[PDB]
Paper text:
Three-dimensional (3D) classification revealed three states with different conformations at the seam and maps were refined to resolutions of 4–6 Å. These states were termed WT-1, WT-2A, and WT-2B and populated to 15%, 43%, and 20%, respectively. WT-1 and WT-2A are largely similar to states KC-1 and KC-2A of ClpB-K476C, whereas WT-2B is reminiscent of ClpB-K476C state 2B. In all three ClpB-WT states all M-domains are fully visible and enclose the AAA1 ring, in agreement with previous findings (Deville et al., 2017). They adopt a horizontal “repressed” conformation, with head-to-tail contacts around the ring. We noticed that five ATPase sites are always inactive in ClpB-WT compared with four in ClpB-K476C. Substrate engagement by ClpB-WT causes full enclosure of the AAA1 ring by all M-domains in a constrained, horizontal conformation. Ordered cycling of AAA domains between different activity states and a large rearrangement of the AAA2 seam subunit and its pore loop are not observed in ClpB-WT.
Residue numbers in the entry:
A (entry chain A): 159 to 287, 293 to 407, 409 to 430, 441 to 858
B (entry chain B): 595 to 858
C (entry chain F): 159 to 287, 293 to 330
D (entry chain E): 199 to 287, 293 to 330
E (entry chain F): 661 to 726
The structure:
């Protein structure tokens, strides 16, 4: 024969129950049977992005052939899974490939249409060394084969819409991703399957949270394959933690260590201590065996329940009379209620932990994938949001108003009250140059997701040309950066949960504001390569200096409201009404006071003492030296980077020179005493 | 031999130009971004015309097609939206000369894609100054006439002859702004009921919202962000405070100058 | 039988101590024991730069099977190391290699889901002459085989990521 | 790893260095464990020159391998052209594979630089 | 010239001969070098310089030497 040599008889497998009873998908099975009951062009192809269960649609079609939900044009049909890889890979020679394939077509035509041929990965058939299309073509035209394809949409439009004859030989059935609730229903059927295998239980809140958080976060793989990945991987982690016991291992190491100690000593007391620890070890071991026996009985009774369900389906196919009522009314409710009695018994007895996969397990598995704070406000990030003013003032002294505004913005977003097409929050930082624009940016990226490195800083001062705009969106096809990628859009597509930091957007060309109009309108910024860039998870922050002299000269005896309205008017003179129209909340910075400069110096002393204690020195400072640093590092035009370069040039250059001179000794208290113009270090 | 329509939505910004088209998409396909949006402020030079149609043979972006023709060759029946149709360069829409004239567009690979079932909508803000100055004491017809003269100063008379109808958006009035606030509060109610809460409001709070969001020069977004701040900041503040308990009616009552949520 | 003809029992060698005391690599044996006990994707492939003892990671898994330091379902498995090289050329006929490999796969169907199979250089399973991929692409989805692959990143990125009925 | 392979560009005296090792075995400049060994170069030619039937070539080759297992490691085998040796008839060199790193078979390789990169480090099963 | 050679050779020494004929953007680049060493080209590749040595030349005080 040929058919047993190359194909996989799926109806025999579904008759042996080795498949998945996939719930739903009723319209796609209907449209596949609409195609398969035609006269010519009997060839549906199942098209969708991978993971959506096109193989499962074919297997569910086979299960409906076996049970008999099909019309009277498919009953008794066999479904055979041709393996396109299993015909190419023997052909060394001229015409041994076509030998096999003509053998397959003669045996299927001997069956006389009684065999629905199934071909998975149909885009292997076309380019496989003329080969396989130009023999199947006279059979696919006359309907004497019954091919069912299964392919990704990209391989469809690449390997078939090219070759138009084999395009019209087939027929599309567009398969869409399932919904969230359909994903939940699918996973409920698959829970009822999977708890036979991993010997555990699954609580349906973990199922719905798994589906929702997988749809929220995993943006490469698609439903339901990613949800099944999460559920199965958590089931395997719990199958580990059945036999992971740690306390028995600690007690065994303790008793063998005290055994070696007592055997070396042969005052004693250790016969008594070892007897107590052996008694505790035996009790924990017997409790462990009791838990194992409980889980074994629960698994066996769950397996007998599922075999009873399979047997009552056997009675639904065959048609025994008393067997139906007997199996149902006896076997289903009593086995379910003592399955729940075993469930509450395991809830009583599992001290040595879980057999029920909770949502925290899903959080641990998805955190091992990516690392998001996946779950909700867990009173650690939530109290962080309740002290988000304090959390931002942990690193950024001063500028209370913008801290409050950004805190309110993220408090709106994490509660789900943002308009979910816009990005998380637009910001127009104003005011004096170099106070903590970038420090608030770093602190925001820090206490948003990870750290200061989950950002993209873009100097907008460099973009002053038309081809600069074509750079930062991406060059259109047939041109240059279309080879070598866009600028902004690639930086977003690498870091999808990030912060975009612009720098002096007023120094940019007067048209990049229109790209920002698209950004702050809807957060899709279609690049040069024609694929969308999704800003709905990010935070766009823009910095400027359009009223730095205006704010520094009028901060005295003017409140926050008049300052905001005045700088709104001035920015309206500079910018356009559309651009400031799309902004969520323009904040206004104020100039710095000398106590804030002293606080910046304090934080620099904190980080410098940390670095030099990692180096190995114990250094103290007089506050007079702090006052000299504060007076030598502020100006109305530059701000606190004068303090930074003053700290660098007056500490980091001379004191490290004194260290490298073999002068200073690690461990000594090093008081940074003052000079007339400098700071001297002593060894005391 | 034409597309279904071809429109030119004019007016000052934020009077509902984009949400009319999203209202179409939510009627027609029951989804907000069930459309094709060519954000025309990227097309400020002619090589981005080569973006939208697809790059020619013997060049880089040949093996992918365009974006527009690929989009419509997938979905033959759609609502093609071209927002901000005058930030772009004046010689971009010659592609749309062909589109509106015959419904055929030739991409790079040489396959004419059928635009006999779409709606080409181009939403401008050219006539913002003239409409904001003279929509008082003028009828609709001469307003359309005069702003169409302004568009003829911007474009060539080839293209505006293709247009099925140019319409004119009027600047918003105060009761319309109150109804905008009502619509925003209704969808806020819907999203928060999906969040699982019982939230009502006093009409005095709505009056204070209308008295804190009116301006003729900016249309509707100051109302939106005023609603955003002066509702969502104390509301989500009390959400993360844990003061909200599900199963409790929340009347957004007034403060002296603010709006407070209550637990009743 | 053919298991005596073409496989290498690691568990007998570790039983007689012929193998090596595997030191460290607790985490990778942990991840292997995870991926070995699922219902889908039941075949790990140990992937790294070559010569880092991926064979000995499988061997230390076998040692922990013998010393009972595994979870309960693995207590009683048999690790067998199928050579790609041992099978090749006793064949003048049109597929005697395929006959012998079919006999081996029927023997592993007879062993009833117990024997855990080892193969290194899994790209040789893909292309070596149906040869070893599509004779086993059924058995890599019919639950009769629990192969443990071992290959470099380049062969995984080419000869496994592409083949979507294997990926 | 009891199998040295020589890696040199073609024509730097690899067979010469193996025969110099053989003369130092004869002259006794080696340690005592190598005093008395036998250096055997495997004749490719006379094996093929009479072969007609199914595996009778490999029958002769397996008989030679059983004689080498009979000699119990007192014979240092040397087969040059190792990249050719891997396929020369389970075929010609992976019959050998368990006997190599067990003290049974000690075949000494000697082969070209690029063909080492062809047929040896890619074929990582014997690496 | 400068940035992409470090991406080719991250393990080397950098010379900038005749820096007296420079331009203030190059001085900005070199202050970015002497601050942290990280420097990104116009298409988005973050390049580190701290594992190298940077050397410059001038020829006016050299004329004072002569
Ligand atoms: N409706 C369903 N009910 C149960 N399981 C399903 C359902 N749809 C998909 N699956 C499972 O999803 C997994 C694979 O889904 P598929 O859609 O078959 O992925 P796929 O068909 O292999 O897609 P590609 O392109 O081949 S990767 C299997 O474990 C199926 O059981
Ligand atoms: N150390 C040496 N002492 C004496 N003659 C040497 C020495 N090294 C090389 N030769 C000579 O160089 C020749 C090289 O012989 P081969 O070893 O066959 O060359 P090869 O480097 O092995 O290249 P192939 O692969 O054998 S053709 C020897 O036959 C000697 O004549
Ligand atoms: N409020 C603050 N708290 C702590 N440190 C700050 C604060 N404001 C500024 N700094 C320091 O001041 C400097 C300002 O530099 P930067 O923010 O890059 O310039 P600009 O202020 O023009 O944006 C930063 O390098 C930072 O180290
Ligand atoms: N746990 C271990 N401790 C010490 N050495 C090890 C360990 N595991 C493997 N090795 C060494 O690795 C070598 C095997 O390399 P291997 O990783 O099997 O090959 P490959 O390069 O094909 O992956 C052995 O010689 C062994 O000594």
């Amino acid at each position: 024969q040929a058919l047993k040599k190359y194909t996989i008889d799926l109806t025999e497998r579904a008759e042996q129950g080795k498949l998945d009873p996939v719930i739903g998908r009723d319209e796609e099975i209907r449209r596949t049977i609409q195609v398969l009951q035609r006269r010519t062009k009997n060839n549906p192809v199942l098209i969708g992005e991978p993971g959506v269960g096109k193989t499962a649609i074919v297997e569910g079609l086979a299960q409906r052939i076996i049970n008999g939900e099909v019309p009277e044009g498919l009953k008794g049909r066999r479904v055979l899974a041709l393996d396109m890889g299993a015909l190419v890979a023997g052909a060394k020679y001229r015409g041994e490939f076509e030998e096999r394939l003509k053998g397959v077509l003669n045996d299927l035509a001997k069956q006389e249409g009684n065999v629905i041929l199934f071909i998975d990965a149909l885009h292997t058939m076309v380019g496989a060394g003329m080969d396989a299309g130009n023999m199947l073509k006279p059979a696919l035209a006359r309907g004497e084969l019954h091919c069912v394809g299964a392919t990704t949409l990209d391989e469809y439009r690449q390997y078939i819409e090219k070759d138009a004859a084999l395009e019209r030989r087939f027929q599309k059935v567009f398969v869409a991703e399932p919904s969230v609730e359909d994903t939940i229903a699918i996973l409920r059927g698959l829970k009822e399957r999977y708890e036979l295998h991993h010997h555990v239980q699954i609580t349906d809140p973990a199922i719905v949270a798994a589906a929702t958080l997988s749809h929220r976060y995993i943006a490469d793989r698609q439903l339901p394959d990613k949800a099944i990945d999460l559920i199965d991987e958590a089931a395997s982690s719990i199958r580990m933690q059945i036999d992971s016991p740690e306390e028995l291992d600690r007690l065994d190491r303790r008793i063998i260590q005290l055994k070696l100690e007592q055997q070396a000593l042969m005052l004693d007391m250790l016969n008594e201590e070892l007897s107590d620890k052996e008694r505790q070890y035996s009790e924990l071991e017997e409790e462990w065996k009791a838990e194992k026996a409980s889980l074994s009985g629960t698994q066996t009774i769950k397996a007998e329940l599922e075999q009873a369900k399979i047997a009552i389906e056997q009675a639904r196919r065959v048609g025994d009379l008393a067997r139906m009522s007997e199996l149902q009314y006896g076997k289903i409710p009593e086995l379910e209620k003592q399955l729940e009695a075993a469930t509450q018994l395991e809830g009583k007895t599992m001290r040595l932990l879980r057999n029920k996969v909770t949502d925290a397990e899903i959080a641990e598995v998805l955190a091992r994938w990516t690392g998001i704070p996946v779950s909700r406000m867990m009173e650690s990030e939530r109290e962080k949001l309740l002290r988000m003013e304090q959390e931002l003032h942990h690193r950024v002294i001063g500028q209370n108003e913008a801290v409050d505004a950004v805190s309110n913005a993220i408090r709106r977003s994490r509660a789900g009250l943002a308009d979910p097409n816009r990005p998380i929050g637009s910001f127009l930082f104003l005011g004096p140059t170099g106070v903590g624009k970038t420090e608030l940016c770093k602190a925001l990226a820090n206490f948003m997701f990870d750290s200061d490195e989950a950002m993209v800083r873009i100097d907008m001062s460099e973009f002053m040309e038309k081809h600069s705009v074509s750079r930062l969106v991406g060059a259109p096809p047939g041109y240059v950066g279309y080879e070598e990628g866009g600028y902004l859009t690639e930086a977003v597509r690498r870091r999808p949960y990030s912060v975009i930091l612009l720098d002096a957007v007023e120094k940019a060309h007067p048209d990049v504001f229109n790209i920002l109009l698209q950004v702050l309108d809807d957060g899709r910024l279609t690049d040069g390569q024609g694929r969308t860039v999704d800003f709905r998870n990010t935070v766009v922050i823009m910095t400027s200096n359009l009223g730095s002299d205006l704010i520094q000269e009028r901060f005295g005896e003017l409140d926050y409201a008049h300052m905001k309205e005045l700088v709104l008017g001035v920015v309206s003179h500079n910018f356009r009404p559309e651009f400031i129209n799309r902004i969520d909340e323009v904040v206004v910075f104020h100039p710095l006071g000398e106590q804030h400069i002293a606080s910046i110096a304090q934080i620099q002393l904190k980080r410098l003492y940390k670095r030099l204690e990692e180096r190995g020195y114990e250094i103290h400072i007089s506050d007079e030296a702090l006052k000299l640093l504060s007076e030598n590092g502020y100006d109305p035009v530059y701000g606190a980077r004068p303090l930074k370069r003053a700290i660098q040039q007056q500490i980091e250059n001379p004191l490290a020179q004194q260290i490298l001179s073999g002068e200073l000794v690690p461990g000594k208290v090093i008081r940074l005493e003052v000079n007339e113009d400098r700071i001297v270090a002593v060894q005391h």
